[PDB]
Design a protein around this ligand. Sequence first.
Ligand SMILES: Cc1cc2nc3c(=O)[nH]c(=O)nc-3n(C[C@H](O)[C@H](O)[C@H](O)COP(=O)(O)OP(=O)(O)OC[C@H]3O[C@@H](n4cnc5c(N)ncnc54)[C@H](O)[C@@H]3O)c2cc1C
Ligand SMILES: Cc1cc2nc3c(=O)[nH]c(=O)nc-3n(C[C@H](O)[C@H](O)[C@H](O)COP(=O)(O)OP(=O)(O)OC[C@H]3O[C@@H](n4cnc5c(N)ncnc54)[C@H](O)[C@@H]3O)c2cc1C
Lengths: 413, 405
Amino acid sequence: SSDICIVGAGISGLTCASHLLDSPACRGLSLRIFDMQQEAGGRIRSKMLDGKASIELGAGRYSPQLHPHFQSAMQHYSQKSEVYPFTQLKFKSHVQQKLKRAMNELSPRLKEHGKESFLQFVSRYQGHDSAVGMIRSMGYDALFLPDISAEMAYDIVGKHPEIQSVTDNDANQWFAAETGFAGLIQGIKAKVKAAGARFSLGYRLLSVRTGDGYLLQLAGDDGWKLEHRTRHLILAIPPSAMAGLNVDFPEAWSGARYGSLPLFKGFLTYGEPWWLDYKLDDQVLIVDNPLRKIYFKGDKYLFFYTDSEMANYWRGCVAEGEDGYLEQIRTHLASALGIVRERIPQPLAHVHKYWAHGVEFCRDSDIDHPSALSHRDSGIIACSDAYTEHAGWMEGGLLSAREASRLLLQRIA
Amino acid sequence: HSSDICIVGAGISGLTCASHLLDSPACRGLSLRIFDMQQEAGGRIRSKMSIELGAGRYSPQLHPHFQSAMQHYSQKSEVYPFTQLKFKSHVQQKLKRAMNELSPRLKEHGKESFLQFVSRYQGHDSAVGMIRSMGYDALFLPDISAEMAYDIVGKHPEIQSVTDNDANQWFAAETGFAGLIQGIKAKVKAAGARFSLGYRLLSVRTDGDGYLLQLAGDDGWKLEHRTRHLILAIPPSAMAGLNVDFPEAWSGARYGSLPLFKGFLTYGEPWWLDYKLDDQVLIVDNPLRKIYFKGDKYLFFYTDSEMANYWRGCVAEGEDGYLEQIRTHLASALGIVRERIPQPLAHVHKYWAHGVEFCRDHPSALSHRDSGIIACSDAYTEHAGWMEGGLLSAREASRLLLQRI
Ligand SMILES: Cc1cc2nc3c(=O)[nH]c(=O)nc-3n(C[C@H](O)[C@H](O)[C@H](O)COP(=O)(O)OP(=O)(O)OC[C@H]3O[C@@H](n4cnc5c(N)ncnc54)[C@H](O)[C@@H]3O)c2cc1C
Ligand SMILES: Cc1cc2nc3c(=O)[nH]c(=O)nc-3n(C[C@H](O)[C@H](O)[C@H](O)COP(=O)(O)OP(=O)(O)OC[C@H]3O[C@@H](n4cnc5c(N)ncnc54)[C@H](O)[C@@H]3O)c2cc1C
């Protein structure tokens, strides 16, 4: 039993625990934190690649100009930052060199047609084939989706490091975590455990019922069933996960609608840093082939990152088998570089991760969305980056946690 | 995503089926796919560096097929010492005699539960005290008949002496039974088996000739796989989750299961040497139930059925309480003060919600009347609860599938 239960130990849930435990109104309230995974962190998943480097299977970068709360958290918990180098395109295609003017040329038309999908918007002025080639040249297949408006696309482009110069946001600086953002998740976790929160990792919330308070049915990843009673409940899970529980989401919560799209990253190490030769170190290529964005980190490893249908494409390759997945990568590396396949070596060790719901966000609405939500009848609070204007970014988790904890403090009344 | 032959389950049964099939001239060049919901093969064999969180011992006398696998794959063995009770309670001293006296009555009343059967002749309280001192709470289950209980006692090393089977010898794997799983795996792979670990079978349908399997990856990825021949090398509990009308359309026997739990602890010093406990096992009434001290390396305990659940509930309530309970029950087992039991340096545990599965009582593998699907598990065998049973089921499941080809 607890007074306060948080389900979700991503950055959102852990940060809620932190604000709550920082407050005098929470003195003497026991706090329980569940997560279905065996480690805290959610979409922040740092990993050692074959003992050679720390890589980010999930969130990988931030900007102090866009993400001031996150920057403040990194400093607070004493995490070392290094420069994220992938902030420009050193090897632009001809289409990519036209991007800035092309985009600038269309911007005033956002007034009249900015609510339609970016693909239709661009197509309205350039026709289909040219719109396709231009949009594809920015490397985020999200920009092809029907539920990404032209206004949303301009926003997206200005906030991603590889293409921020297209909308003239080159001033924004970007950083990564020298030892992984998991170190921040560990630092928050250590702080909340030190203040008395109790962690139950490995349990998946299946359903919730109200009488004075709440009764939760959870299942352990080894089969162990658990029931837990709390007086106050924050579900620090994304919209997709909310939809799996029996709490009538979103009708009973906001009635807003939430989009979702998958993500994929693959990291590969090589015997020789063969890309040094071509001056690719610390650079990113954005290409039309299914690798889409190819990043070469120093002389240590390379990786690629894709979304939406290309993420599903890569996951399907993996399902067929390692060998064909690796060979497909080699074929697309050779095409991207314009050199012959046998000149791309075979990798030494690699890792990959597919996120079925890597990004979740509020769909374009005329209703303002609050940063955290509560259930009409039950007073259950819902916390996620998806509910903020930084949907898709750790910053939106911090923003949502601030509001969720504020709301819980006010319910505690 | 298709195969000629698909095996779901990469425990020792599934891997051994793949082994048999890939050895047969009839499967030369056929495409063979093996799925498992976990990210590593092995199932209920799980080694950690070296302790056994799952299966931990075998006997050459009881498990000749197992001994032959260990031999064929050059896996080394070490004496498993926990083969007699050095510190018998008064009740434990009486067990061999009392079990000898009851045994003639199995022919009359041996189909009753072991508890009923012993109560019948000794009374409830006496039966409880006796049955308890054998250390397997499976022996209290209405599902476990007197005749099955005697089979159980004769097969388990810590109490085999009780039915005149001290002669049976026991060994563990010197590098863990996972090295055996890794050997079978590397061999089926070299022969061209393809693995898809991390996928859970949800359902199957018989699309024309063949079968269409629906699977979910552990990251959510949904996958459909077509095959021409199918072995489900999963236990009955898992078969029941599928859409294949198990057990009715197969055997029509009924199947039992019970949970298991093991906890392992290490210490700055092997403190138990003071009590001459190295390489000895104690069976106690308290919740630890069977407590083993392994040379001067570590100790562990091993429980089943409702004491397995007790320990899983403890773990769920938190580490401190769990570690404290263990410390409390170790002192009572030894009859010494709590403070004489140091705090561990490290520990690990594992709960198996379906640790043992068995037929309530049968061929060694099954097949579905209508669909031709084959089912393979130690549960369908005379060695349910043992890796040997898995090897026997795989022989038969392989034989059935070769027939089908
Ligand atoms: C590939 C990828 C790259 C990214 N890159 C960046 C980047 O460069 N910069 C950046 O700022 N952001 C990035 N992000 C986004 C960032 O990861 C998210 O914005 C943030 O991590 C979300 O935190 P959260 O705590 O709201 O949700 P999550 O991190 O999703 O955590 C929710 C938690 O709830 C748990 N859960 C869900 N349902 C249940 C249930 N029923 N019971 C129990 N537990 C449950 C999950 O296990 C999870 O731990 C990236 C994301 C991905 C996927
Ligand atoms: C605690 C413990 C101690 C033991 N000690 C001993 C011992 O000392 N000696 C001994 O001989 N035996 C022992 N055993 C028994 C031995 O572990 C088993 O008899 C044997 O390993 C069973 O092998 P199997 O391949 O038939 O089934 P499992 O090992 O249970 O393999 C079944 C596999 O199927 C997979 N699976 C299930 N459902 C699905 C699905 N829907 N989709 C995909 N995959 C699926 C599982 O992930 C698993 O890998 C012990 C067992 C336990 C639990």
